């Protein structure tokens, strides 16, 4: 058989539904969202980390001349000076008032520790969802996993069940993000080849060990100092450490709907929001002919007690008469309240007690046992404890919290003087005619 | 050591501390709304929830 | 669970009360004032004989 139904996005909340077919008992279908897996599409842009500068041995020409060449090293720079007398422990290596010249150069490369301290800039897009479901029909359980896209059915027993699309798309990921040491930070990094001294992503590389590298961090060389050979240099602090000191808090502590986010897939998990439609195909073998199912007689509904609460705090009682033995499912045809158990042993004249919960204190609804059903009305009270994190609001409110007493007061309240007004107008017309008699 | 007051909505709230797994805590309503067949100040409960 | 109730001052008089909770039988609570002990604050002034 075939059926369809919509379920809200939420993990570990069984929903119980019925499929009705004349001549066959209505099977109880249990649907649970075991887990959620939102996986977007990712693109790698470039890596970055703390950098180490290079101060190579200088190129000193004793009583000659030199120049400022070019090279492919990232942040490569050169500069030359003349009339320099460098010294050293053995003495002065060379002195020529003008002919001496010194040439210095500088570049940079990722530090050796970068291999593990590196962060990466990611371009993300097109959030896609993967959902794991547990579906039980007639004590026939099945574990399945599928995308929410309406095209693909996940394979479980070769039963193709379609679902989606998502009611409303939610994505804590911004189009641009950064990843570091298992943490994901929402940030707007600059484009590849776009750098700013003292800013994040001052150094770039397609790979952690790629030979090609590019950066720009305001490295201007300084003139040689007094009498001692060295290379006085200058450069702005790494943007990596700066951004680290002020990167902001991780997205782990800011995502809505309690997302659980992991890096190696760059995905979210157990993050719930929205609703999903589902199409379900069922073999007719699983179905049971009604005559095989037991029949019931003169069943009554009795509310032992019920306090409005969050857990299955509502309790009900049922007295039934039957001509057969076996099992029947039970269902709450009214959405406002939902049971906790599916079926139970039956009896010729036995009675049972049932658990349930509701979104309103007004326990007025109808409930079905076997194929028959009976009404159930009562009042439930709010609880004392008002703070718990266990599953709650399994059903959303439908402005049905309005008590029957409030409806009674409202109905008798609204006036109907307009009828008196019309009667007054009619008698006015008749009296006007009578006066016209004169 | 000190104390802090955090408001919790009907939906649910996360809670972190120390270096152990967090615990999620939500809330519901407990104000005295429903009457018992006699005159009552039910409104107050409906005022406690959705002042709109 | 939590509850509150007022009882008169008197010794050896059990009072029976109920705590009501939907889905749970109302437990019978028995309260007895075994004894009373009123102790004021004292100050010694002086002895005589
Ligand atoms: C499921 O229930 C049917 C009767 O409703 C029974 O015949 C069958 O053996 C059950 N299957 C399992 C696995 O319990």
Coordinates of C-alpha atoms and ligand atoms in Angstrom, one line a residue:
Chain A
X1 CA 0.0 0.0 0.0
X2 CA 1.0 3.7 -0.3
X3 CA 0.6 6.6 2.1
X4 CA 2.0 10.1 2.7
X5 CA 2.5 12.2 5.8
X6 CA 4.5 15.2 7.0
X7 CA 6.7 15.2 10.2
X8 CA 8.6 18.0 11.9
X9 CA 12.3 18.0 12.0
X10 CA 13.4 16.7 15.5
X11 CA 15.5 13.7 16.7
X12 CA 14.3 10.8 18.7
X13 CA 10.6 11.6 18.8
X14 CA 8.5 8.7 17.6
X15 CA 5.3 9.6 15.7
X16 CA 2.5 7.0 15.5
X17 CA 0.2 7.0 12.5
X18 CA -2.4 4.7 11.0
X19 CA -3.1 3.4 7.5
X20 CA -6.8 2.6 7.0
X21 CA -8.0 -0.1 4.6
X22 CA -11.5 -1.7 4.6
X23 CA -11.2 -5.4 5.3
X24 CA -7.8 -4.9 6.9
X25 CA -6.8 -3.8 10.4
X26 CA -5.2 -0.3 10.4
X27 CA -1.5 -0.9 11.0
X28 CA 0.3 1.2 13.5
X29 CA 3.3 2.9 11.9
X30 CA 6.1 4.3 14.1
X31 CA 8.5 6.9 12.6
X32 CA 11.6 8.1 14.4
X33 CA 14.3 10.5 13.2
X34 CA 17.4 8.7 14.6
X35 CA 19.8 11.5 13.5
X36 CA 20.2 14.3 11.1
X37 CA 23.2 15.1 8.8
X38 CA 23.3 18.4 6.9
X39 CA 26.3 18.3 4.5
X40 CA 26.9 21.4 2.3
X41 CA 29.2 21.6 -0.7
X42 CA 32.7 22.9 0.0
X43 CA 35.6 24.4 -1.9
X44 CA 39.1 25.0 -0.6
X45 CA 40.5 28.4 -1.2
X46 CA 43.9 28.7 0.6
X47 CA 45.7 27.8 3.8
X48 CA 47.4 30.2 6.3
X49 CA 49.4 30.0 9.5
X50 CA 52.1 31.8 11.4
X51 CA 55.0 32.7 9.2
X52 CA 58.8 32.6 9.7
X53 CA 61.0 35.2 7.9
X54 CA 64.3 34.5 6.2
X55 CA 67.4 36.6 6.6
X56 CA 69.9 34.9 4.3
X57 CA 73.7 35.6 4.5
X58 CA 74.2 39.0 2.9
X59 CA 75.8 39.6 -0.5
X60 CA 78.7 41.8 0.2
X61 CA 81.0 43.0 -2.6
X62 CA 84.4 44.1 -1.3
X63 CA 85.3 47.3 -3.1
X64 CA 83.0 46.9 -6.1
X65 CA 79.3 47.2 -7.0
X66 CA 76.1 45.3 -6.9
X67 CA 72.4 45.6 -7.7
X68 CA 68.9 44.7 -6.5
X69 CA 67.7 41.6 -8.5
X70 CA 64.3 39.9 -8.6
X71 CA 63.0 36.5 -7.4
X72 CA 59.8 34.5 -7.1
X73 CA 59.9 34.1 -3.3
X74 CA 56.8 35.4 -1.5
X75 CA 57.4 38.9 -0.1
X76 CA 60.8 38.9 -1.7
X77 CA 62.7 42.2 -1.4
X78 CA 66.2 43.4 -1.9
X79 CA 68.1 46.6 -1.1
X80 CA 71.6 47.8 -1.5
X81 CA 74.0 50.3 0.2
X82 CA 77.5 51.5 -0.3
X83 CA 80.5 52.8 1.7
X84 CA 80.1 50.2 4.5
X85 CA 82.8 48.8 6.7
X86 CA 81.6 45.5 8.2
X87 CA 83.6 44.0 11.1
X88 CA 83.9 40.6 12.7
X89 CA 85.8 38.9 15.5
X90 CA 88.9 38.3 13.4
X91 CA 88.7 42.0 12.5
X92 CA 87.4 44.1 9.6
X93 CA 86.9 41.8 6.6
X94 CA 87.0 44.7 4.1
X95 CA 86.9 48.5 4.0
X96 CA 86.7 50.8 0.9
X97 CA 85.2 54.2 1.6
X98 CA 82.9 54.1 -1.4
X99 CA 83.7 50.9 -3.4
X100 CA 82.4 48.6 -0.7
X101 CA 78.7 47.6 -1.2
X102 CA 76.3 45.5 0.7
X103 CA 73.1 43.8 -0.6
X104 CA 70.4 42.3 1.6
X105 CA 67.3 40.4 0.7
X106 CA 64.3 39.0 2.6
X107 CA 61.4 36.6 2.1
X108 CA 59.2 34.4 4.2
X109 CA 57.8 30.9 4.5
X110 CA 55.3 29.0 6.6
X111 CA 56.8 27.9 9.9
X112 CA 57.6 24.2 10.5
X113 CA 54.9 23.9 13.2
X114 CA 52.3 25.2 10.7
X115 CA 51.9 21.6 9.6
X116 CA 49.5 21.3 12.6
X117 CA 48.7 24.9 13.5
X118 CA 47.4 25.7 10.0
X119 CA 44.0 27.2 9.4
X120 CA 42.1 27.0 6.1
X121 CA 39.7 29.3 4.3
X122 CA 36.6 27.5 2.9
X123 CA 34.0 28.6 0.4
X124 CA 30.7 26.8 1.2
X125 CA 27.3 26.7 -0.6
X126 CA 24.3 24.6 -1.4
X127 CA 23.5 23.1 2.0
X128 CA 22.3 19.5 1.5
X129 CA 20.6 17.2 4.1
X130 CA 21.0 13.6 5.0
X131 CA 18.6 12.0 7.4
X132 CA 18.6 8.7 9.3
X133 CA 15.2 7.2 10.1
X134 CA 13.9 4.2 12.0
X135 CA 10.5 3.0 10.7
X136 CA 8.4 0.2 12.4
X137 CA 5.3 -1.3 10.7
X138 CA 3.6 -4.3 12.3
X139 CA 6.6 -5.2 14.4
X140 CA 8.6 -4.9 11.2
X141 CA 11.5 -2.6 12.0
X142 CA 13.8 -0.9 9.3
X143 CA 16.8 1.4 9.6
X144 CA 17.2 3.7 6.6
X145 CA 19.2 6.7 5.6
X146 CA 18.4 9.1 2.7
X147 CA 18.6 12.6 1.4
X148 CA 15.6 15.0 1.8
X149 CA 15.6 15.6 -1.9
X150 CA 12.3 14.5 -3.4
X151 CA 14.0 12.4 -6.1
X152 CA 16.2 9.9 -4.3
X153 CA 14.7 7.1 -2.1
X154 CA 17.0 5.6 0.5
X155 CA 17.4 1.8 0.3
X156 CA 16.3 -0.2 3.2
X157 CA 14.8 -3.7 2.5
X158 CA 14.5 -2.3 -1.1
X159 CA 11.5 -0.2 0.2
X160 CA 11.7 3.2 -1.6
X161 CA 10.3 5.9 0.7
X162 CA 10.6 9.4 -0.6
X163 CA 10.6 12.5 1.6
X164 CA 11.1 16.3 1.3
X165 CA 11.8 18.9 0.2
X166 CA 12.6 20.7 3.4
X167 CA 9.8 23.1 4.5
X168 CA 12.3 25.9 5.2
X169 CA 16.1 25.9 4.6
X170 CA 18.3 26.7 7.5
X171 CA 22.1 27.1 7.3
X172 CA 24.3 28.4 10.1
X173 CA 27.2 28.3 7.6
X174 CA 28.0 31.6 5.8
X175 CA 29.3 31.3 2.3
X176 CA 32.8 31.9 3.7
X177 CA 34.2 30.1 6.7
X178 CA 37.5 29.3 8.4
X179 CA 38.6 26.0 9.9
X180 CA 41.4 25.5 12.6
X181 CA 42.2 22.5 14.8
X182 CA 38.7 21.0 14.6
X183 CA 36.9 24.4 15.1
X184 CA 34.8 26.3 12.5
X185 CA 34.7 30.1 12.7
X186 CA 32.3 32.2 10.6
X187 CA 34.4 34.8 8.9
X188 CA 34.7 36.8 5.6
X189 CA 38.3 36.1 4.5
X190 CA 39.8 38.0 1.6
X191 CA 40.2 36.5 -1.9
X192 CA 43.2 34.4 -2.9
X193 CA 46.0 36.8 -3.9
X194 CA 44.4 39.6 -1.8
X195 CA 46.5 40.4 1.3
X196 CA 46.9 43.3 3.7
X197 CA 49.8 43.6 6.2
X198 CA 48.6 43.0 9.8
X199 CA 45.4 41.3 8.5
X200 CA 44.1 37.8 8.5
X201 CA 45.3 35.6 5.7
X202 CA 48.5 37.5 5.0
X203 CA 50.1 34.3 3.7
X204 CA 48.5 31.9 1.2
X205 CA 49.2 28.5 -0.2
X206 CA 47.1 26.1 -2.3
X207 CA 48.5 23.3 -0.1
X208 CA 50.1 23.1 3.3
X209 CA 53.4 22.3 1.6
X210 CA 52.9 23.8 -1.8
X211 CA 56.1 25.4 -3.1
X212 CA 54.2 28.3 -4.5
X213 CA 53.4 31.0 -1.9
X214 CA 52.3 34.6 -1.9
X215 CA 52.0 37.3 0.8
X216 CA 52.4 41.0 1.5
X217 CA 53.2 42.2 5.0
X218 CA 55.0 45.5 4.6
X219 CA 58.6 44.4 4.8
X220 CA 60.9 47.4 4.2
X221 CA 64.7 46.9 4.8
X222 CA 66.7 49.1 7.1
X223 CA 70.1 50.7 6.6
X224 CA 73.1 48.9 8.2
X225 CA 73.9 49.9 11.7
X226 CA 77.2 51.0 13.2
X227 CA 80.3 48.9 12.4
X228 CA 78.7 45.5 12.9
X229 CA 77.5 43.3 10.0
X230 CA 73.8 42.4 10.3
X231 CA 70.5 42.8 8.6
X232 CA 68.1 45.2 10.4
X233 CA 64.6 44.5 9.1
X234 CA 61.1 45.5 9.8
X235 CA 57.7 43.9 9.2
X236 CA 54.2 43.8 10.7
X237 CA 52.9 41.2 13.1
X238 CA 51.2 38.1 11.7
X239 CA 47.5 38.5 11.1
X240 CA 47.2 34.9 12.3
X241 CA 48.0 35.7 15.9
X242 CA 45.9 38.9 15.8
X243 CA 42.9 37.1 14.5
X244 CA 43.5 34.3 17.1
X245 CA 43.4 36.9 19.9
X246 CA 40.1 38.3 18.5
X247 CA 38.7 35.5 16.2
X248 CA 35.5 35.6 18.2
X249 CA 33.8 32.6 19.7
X250 CA 33.4 29.3 17.8
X251 CA 30.2 28.7 15.8
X252 CA 29.7 25.7 18.0
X253 CA 28.3 28.0 20.7
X254 CA 26.3 30.2 18.4
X255 CA 24.5 28.0 15.9
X256 CA 20.7 27.8 16.3
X257 CA 18.7 24.7 16.8
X258 CA 21.5 23.0 18.8
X259 CA 23.6 22.0 15.8
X260 CA 26.5 19.6 16.4
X261 CA 29.1 20.5 13.9
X262 CA 32.1 18.5 12.8
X263 CA 35.0 19.4 10.5
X264 CA 36.3 16.5 8.4
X265 CA 32.9 16.4 6.6
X266 CA 32.2 20.1 7.4
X267 CA 28.7 19.0 8.4
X268 CA 26.0 19.6 11.0
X269 CA 24.2 16.9 12.9
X270 CA 21.2 16.5 15.3
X271 CA 20.1 20.1 14.3
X272 CA 16.3 20.3 14.1
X273 CA 14.0 22.8 12.4
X274 CA 11.1 22.7 9.9
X275 CA 9.0 19.9 8.5
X276 CA 9.4 17.3 5.9
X277 CA 6.8 15.4 3.7
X278 CA 7.3 11.7 3.3
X279 CA 5.9 9.1 0.9
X280 CA 5.8 5.5 2.1
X281 CA 5.2 2.3 0.1
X282 CA 4.2 -0.8 2.0
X283 CA 3.9 -4.5 1.0
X284 CA 0.4 -5.8 1.3
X285 CA 1.8 -8.9 3.0
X286 CA 2.5 -6.8 6.2
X287 CA -1.2 -5.9 6.2
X288 CA -3.7 -8.2 8.1
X289 CA -7.2 -9.0 7.1
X290 CA -9.8 -7.5 9.5
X291 CA -11.6 -10.8 10.2
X292 CA -8.2 -12.1 11.4
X293 CA -8.0 -9.1 13.6
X294 CA -10.1 -9.2 16.8
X295 CA -13.4 -7.3 17.0
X296 CA -14.5 -5.1 19.9
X297 CA -17.8 -4.2 21.5
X298 CA -19.2 -1.4 23.7
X299 CA -15.9 0.2 24.7
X300 CA -15.9 3.1 27.1
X301 CA -13.4 5.8 27.8
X302 CA -12.5 6.7 31.4
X303 CA -10.0 9.2 32.5
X304 CA -8.4 8.0 35.8
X305 CA -6.5 11.3 36.1
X306 CA -4.4 13.7 34.0
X307 CA -2.2 16.7 34.8
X308 CA -1.0 18.9 32.0
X309 CA 2.7 18.4 31.7
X310 CA 5.6 17.7 29.3
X311 CA 6.2 14.0 29.6
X312 CA 3.5 11.3 29.3
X313 CA 1.8 12.7 32.4
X314 CA -1.7 12.1 31.0
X315 CA -3.4 8.8 32.1
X316 CA -6.5 7.2 30.6
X317 CA -8.5 4.0 31.1
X318 CA -10.4 1.8 28.7
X319 CA -13.0 -0.9 29.2
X320 CA -13.7 -3.1 26.2
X321 CA -15.7 -6.2 25.2
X322 CA -14.3 -8.4 22.5
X323 CA -15.2 -11.7 20.7
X324 CA -11.6 -12.5 19.8
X325 CA -8.1 -12.6 21.1
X326 CA -4.9 -11.1 19.7
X327 CA -3.7 -7.5 19.4
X328 CA -5.0 -4.1 18.2
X329 CA -3.2 -0.8 17.8
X330 CA -4.4 2.4 19.4
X331 CA -4.3 5.9 18.1
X332 CA -5.2 9.5 19.0
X333 CA -7.0 10.8 16.0
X334 CA -6.8 14.3 17.5
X335 CA -3.4 15.9 17.0
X336 CA -3.4 17.9 20.3
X337 CA -2.6 14.7 22.3
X338 CA -0.5 11.7 21.5
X339 CA -0.2 8.3 23.2
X340 CA 2.9 6.6 24.4
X341 CA 2.3 2.9 23.5
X342 CA 1.1 1.3 20.3
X343 CA -0.8 -1.9 21.1
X344 CA -1.5 -4.4 24.0
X345 CA -2.9 -7.8 24.7
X346 CA -6.6 -7.9 24.2
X347 CA -9.4 -9.8 26.1
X348 CA -13.0 -10.7 25.8
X349 CA -14.0 -8.2 28.4
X350 CA -10.7 -6.8 29.8
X351 CA -9.7 -3.2 30.5
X352 CA -6.4 -1.3 30.2
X353 CA -4.6 1.9 31.3
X354 CA -2.8 4.1 28.9
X355 CA -0.2 6.9 29.0
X356 CA -0.2 10.0 26.8
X357 CA 0.7 13.7 26.6
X358 CA -0.9 16.8 25.2
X359 CA -0.3 20.4 24.2
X360 CA -3.4 21.6 25.9
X361 CA -5.0 21.0 29.4
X362 CA -8.4 20.3 27.7
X363 CA -8.4 16.5 27.3
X364 CA -11.3 16.6 24.8
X365 CA -10.6 14.4 21.7
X366 CA -11.4 11.0 20.2
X367 CA -9.2 7.9 20.3
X368 CA -9.4 4.7 18.2
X369 CA -8.9 1.1 19.4
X370 CA -8.9 -1.7 16.8
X371 CA -11.0 0.0 14.0
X372 CA -13.6 1.5 16.4
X373 CA -13.2 4.7 18.4
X374 CA -14.6 6.4 21.5
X375 CA -14.6 10.0 22.7
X376 CA -12.7 11.2 25.8
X377 CA -13.2 14.5 27.6
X378 CA -11.6 15.8 30.8
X379 CA -9.6 18.6 32.3
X380 CA -5.8 18.5 33.0
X381 CA -3.9 20.8 35.3
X382 CA -0.6 22.5 34.9
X383 CA 2.3 21.0 36.8
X384 CA 4.4 22.4 39.6
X385 CA 7.9 21.8 38.1
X386 CA 8.3 24.0 35.1
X387 CA 11.9 23.5 34.0
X388 CA 12.9 20.3 32.1
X389 CA 14.9 19.6 29.0
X390 CA 13.4 16.2 28.2
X391 CA 11.3 15.9 25.1
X392 CA 8.4 18.3 25.2
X393 CA 6.0 20.1 22.9
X394 CA 5.9 17.0 20.8
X395 CA 2.8 18.7 19.4
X396 CA 2.8 22.4 18.6
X397 CA 0.1 24.5 20.2
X398 CA -3.0 25.3 18.1
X399 CA -4.6 28.0 20.2
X400 CA -6.5 25.2 21.9
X401 CA -5.3 26.0 25.4
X402 CA -8.5 28.0 25.6
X403 CA -10.5 26.2 28.3
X404 CA -14.2 25.2 27.8
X405 CA -15.1 27.5 30.7
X406 CA -13.5 30.5 28.8
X407 CA -15.5 29.6 25.7
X408 CA -18.7 29.4 27.9
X409 CA -18.0 32.9 29.3
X410 CA -17.2 34.3 25.8
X411 CA -20.3 32.8 24.1
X412 CA -22.8 34.3 26.6
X413 CA -20.8 37.5 26.6
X414 CA -21.0 38.8 23.0
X415 CA -24.3 40.7 22.7
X416 CA -27.0 40.5 20.1
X417 CA -28.6 43.9 20.6
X418 CA -28.6 44.3 16.8
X419 CA -31.7 42.0 16.7
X420 CA -33.3 44.4 19.2
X421 CA -32.3 47.3 16.9
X422 CA -33.9 45.6 13.9
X423 CA -37.1 44.9 15.9
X424 CA -37.1 48.6 17.0
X425 CA -36.7 49.7 13.4
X426 CA -39.6 47.4 12.3
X427 CA -41.9 48.7 15.0
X428 CA -40.8 52.2 14.1
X429 CA -41.9 51.6 10.5
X430 CA -45.3 50.2 11.6
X431 CA -45.8 53.1 14.0
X432 CA -44.8 55.6 11.3
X433 CA -47.5 54.1 9.0
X434 CA -50.0 54.2 11.8
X435 CA -49.2 57.9 12.3
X436 CA -49.5 58.4 8.6
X437 CA -53.1 57.2 9.1
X438 CA -53.6 60.4 11.2
Chain B
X1 CA 31.6 31.6 42.9
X2 CA 28.4 33.5 42.2
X3 CA 24.9 33.1 40.8
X4 CA 23.4 33.9 37.4
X5 CA 19.8 34.2 36.2
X6 CA 19.2 32.9 32.6
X7 CA 15.7 33.1 31.0
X8 CA 14.5 30.0 29.2
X9 CA 11.9 29.9 26.5
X10 CA 9.3 27.2 25.8
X11 CA 11.4 25.9 23.0
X12 CA 14.6 24.9 24.8
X13 CA 18.0 26.1 26.0
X14 CA 21.5 24.8 25.9
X15 CA 23.8 25.0 29.0
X16 CA 27.6 24.6 29.2
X17 CA 30.1 24.6 32.0
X18 CA 33.4 23.2 33.0
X19 CA 34.9 20.8 30.4
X20 CA 32.2 18.1 30.4
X21 CA 29.3 17.4 28.0
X22 CA 26.5 20.0 28.3
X23 CA 22.9 19.5 29.3
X24 CA 19.8 20.8 27.6
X25 CA 17.1 22.3 29.8
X26 CA 13.7 23.5 28.6
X27 CA 10.6 24.8 30.4
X28 CA 6.8 24.7 30.5
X29 CA 3.9 26.6 32.2
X30 CA 2.7 26.2 35.7
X31 CA 0.6 29.4 36.5
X32 CA -2.9 28.8 38.0
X33 CA -5.2 29.2 35.1
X34 CA -8.0 26.6 35.0
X35 CA -10.9 27.2 37.4
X36 CA -12.9 24.7 39.4
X37 CA -16.5 25.6 38.6
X38 CA -16.4 28.8 40.7
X39 CA -15.4 32.4 40.0
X40 CA -11.6 32.6 39.6
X41 CA -8.8 34.9 38.5
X42 CA -7.9 32.7 35.5
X43 CA -6.7 35.8 33.5
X44 CA -3.4 35.9 35.6
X45 CA -2.2 32.6 34.1
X46 CA -3.1 33.8 30.6
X47 CA -1.2 37.0 31.5
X48 CA 1.9 35.0 32.6
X49 CA 2.0 33.3 29.2
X50 CA 1.9 35.5 26.1
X51 CA 1.2 39.0 27.6
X52 CA 0.2 39.6 24.0
Chain C
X1 CA 7.6 16.4 45.4
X2 CA 6.8 19.4 47.5
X3 CA 3.8 20.3 49.7
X4 CA 2.8 22.6 52.5
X5 CA 0.2 22.5 55.3
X6 CA -0.6 24.0 58.7
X7 CA -1.1 22.0 61.9
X8 CA -2.2 23.1 65.4
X9 CA 0.2 22.8 68.3
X10 CA -0.7 19.7 70.2
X11 CA 1.2 16.5 71.2
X12 CA 0.4 13.0 70.1
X13 CA -2.4 13.8 67.6
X14 CA -1.7 12.2 64.2
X15 CA -2.9 14.2 61.3
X16 CA -3.5 12.4 57.9
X17 CA -3.1 14.3 54.7
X18 CA -2.9 13.6 51.0
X19 CA -0.5 14.6 48.2
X20 CA -2.3 14.5 44.8
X21 CA -0.4 13.9 41.5
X22 CA -1.9 12.7 38.2
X23 CA -0.5 9.3 37.2
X24 CA 0.5 8.6 40.8
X25 CA -1.6 7.3 43.7
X26 CA -2.1 10.0 46.5
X27 CA 0.2 9.1 49.3
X28 CA -1.1 9.2 52.8
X29 CA 1.1 11.4 55.0
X30 CA 0.9 11.0 58.8
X31 CA 2.2 13.8 61.0
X32 CA 2.6 13.6 64.8
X33 CA 4.0 16.1 67.3
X34 CA 5.9 13.7 69.5
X35 CA 6.9 16.4 71.9
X36 CA 7.5 20.2 72.3
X37 CA 10.5 22.0 73.7
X38 CA 10.3 25.8 74.3
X39 CA 13.7 27.0 75.3
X40 CA 14.2 30.8 76.0
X41 CA 17.4 32.7 76.3
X42 CA 18.7 33.1 79.9
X43 CA 21.1 35.4 81.8
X44 CA 22.3 34.9 85.3
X45 CA 22.1 37.9 87.6
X46 CA 23.0 36.9 91.1
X47 CA 22.6 34.2 93.7
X48 CA 21.1 34.5 97.2
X49 CA 20.4 32.3 100.3
Ligands
LIG1 C1 4.1 -9.3 14.4 O1 2.7 -9.5 14.8 C2 2.0 -10.5 14.1 C3 0.6 -10.4 14.5 O2 0.1 -9.1 14.6 C4 2.7 -11.9 14.4 O3 2.0 -12.9 13.7 C5 4.1 -11.8 14.1 O4 4.8 -13.0 14.5 C6 4.8 -10.6 14.8 N1 6.2 -10.6 14.4 C7 7.2 -10.4 15.3 C8 8.6 -10.3 14.7 O5 7.0 -10.3 16.5

